[PDB]
Structure 1
Amino acid sequence: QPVNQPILAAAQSLHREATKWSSKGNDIIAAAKRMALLMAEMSRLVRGGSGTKRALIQCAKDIAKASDEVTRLAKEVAKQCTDKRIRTNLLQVCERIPTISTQLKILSTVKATMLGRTNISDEESEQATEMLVHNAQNLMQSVKETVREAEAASIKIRTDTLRWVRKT
């Protein structure tokens, strides 16, 4: 079945970072894994024509809901961080996520309306897919960086409640 080479790669990228840690007692990890799974579904759905219109919109809505969980918890971690440099960096990344996921909903709705509809040009179709691709990459990158920084920050708060256990 057809899948977006770019969208699926961004999903896998996030999964590789998210997959290593355990979800047990870690809702950042669980939401990030859920986001990467839904993003892999998205790359399939973009390709599909009829009947993919409602699934594409709902998939983006689910990705945005899971990203609110990531953002909410990472903000909590940042607001317990003593180092301003780390606190600011973690707040910078995790505050990009709501904007990107709001933009994912807009661009998925745009792409969904077009799917199977011959009234729009190949140019408009290609740009809509491209805009969606760039948004998916940015979202996956931001969550990956949020996972890394949230873990790094947690050790400091703890050394100086989410569970961070490396998987094998």
Structure 2
Amino acid sequence: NDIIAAAKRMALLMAEMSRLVRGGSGTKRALIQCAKDIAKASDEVTRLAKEVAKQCTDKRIRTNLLQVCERIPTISTQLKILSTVKATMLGRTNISDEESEQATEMLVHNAQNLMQSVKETVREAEAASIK
């Protein structure tokens, strides 16, 4: 089941992202690449969720699956943008530690919202696989 495979891949990347955000200035390039890799996996979940929805035999489950998966593009796009912002704050000539910490908290929060939407997408995908 390639949605479950993508979701487990995303979880392993999110475990690596968790390790990277606890580091110092040395995790800068790794953190940007991790976010890029997570966004690539989220696009695969969205593509597969639409395909599973097409193959499903009930309008209601299909509608719910389309509703939840359509937020994944906007949140994954915000993760890519917020990663560019955080990149320009790391190593900046004058920047506050409190502002850096709040940017990290926002980035983790956005990742948590993306993961929660994918978690709900998995629940509806499991339900869609019945019919």
Sort the TM-score into its range (normalised by shorter chain). 0.7 to 0.9
Q: Is the 8 A contact 2:61 2:127 kept in 1?
A: no
* Structure 1: distance between partners of 2:80 and 2:38: 9
Residue 43 to residue 118, structure 1, CA distance change in 2 (3 Å): farther
Moved segments of 4+, more than 4 Å = none
Cα displacement (A) at 1:49 = 2.2
Cα displacement (A) at 1:151 = 1.2
* Structure 1: distance between partners of 2:12 and 2:72: 17
- Per the alignment, residue 162 of structure 1 pairs with none
1:117-140 superposed Cα distances (whole Å, 9 cap, x missing partner)? 572123422331222122111111
What is the TM-score when the length of structure 1 is the normalising length? 0.70
- Per the alignment, residue 94 of structure 2 pairs with 119
Cα displacement (A) at 1:34 = 1.0
1:69-101 superposed Cα distances (whole Å, 9 cap, x missing partner)? 111111111123333222111001111112211
Moved more, 55-64 or 93-102: 93-102
* Structure 2: distance between partners of 1:76 and 1:144: 17
- Per the alignment, residue 65 of structure 2 pairs with 90
Cα displacement (A) at 1:41 = 1.1
Q: CA RMSD in A?
A: 1.8
Cα displacement (A) at 1:116 = 5.4
Higher helix share: 2
Cα displacement (A) at 1:56 = 0.8
Query: How many residue pairs were aligned?
Result: 131
Q: Is the 8 A contact 2:39 2:76 kept in 1?
A: yes
* Structure 1: distance between partners of 2:76 and 2:50: 16
Residue 133 to residue 50, structure 1, CA distance change in 2 (3 Å): closer
* Structure 2: distance between partners of 1:61 and 1:123: 25
Q: Is the 8 A contact 1:93 1:146 kept in 2?
A: yes
* Structure 2: distance between partners of 1:123 and 1:51: 18
Q: Is the 8 A contact 2:13 2:34 kept in 1?
A: yes
* Structure 2: distance between partners of 1:47 and 1:113: 18
Moved more, 86-95 or 113-122: 113-122
- Per the alignment, residue 23 of structure 1 pairs with none
Identity of aligned residues (%): 100
What is the TM-score when the length of structure 2 is the normalising length? 0.88
Q: Is the 8 A contact 1:81 1:153 kept in 2?
A: yes
